[PDB]
C-alpha cells in the first residue's frame, strides 16, 4: 500500500527521471 513508495514510486523515478539526467549529464 505504502509499498508502492519504494516499488512503482522510486524505481519508476531512477528508470526515468535519473536515467535520463545522469545519461545526458554524461553523454
Excluded: D, R
Excluded at 513508495?5 to 539526467?21: M, R, Y
Amino acid at each position: 500500500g505504502i509499498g508502492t513508495k519504494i516499488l512503482g514510486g522510486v524505481k519508476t523515478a531512477l528508470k526515468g527521471a535519473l536515467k535520463e539526467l545522469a545519461s545526458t549529464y554524461a553523454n
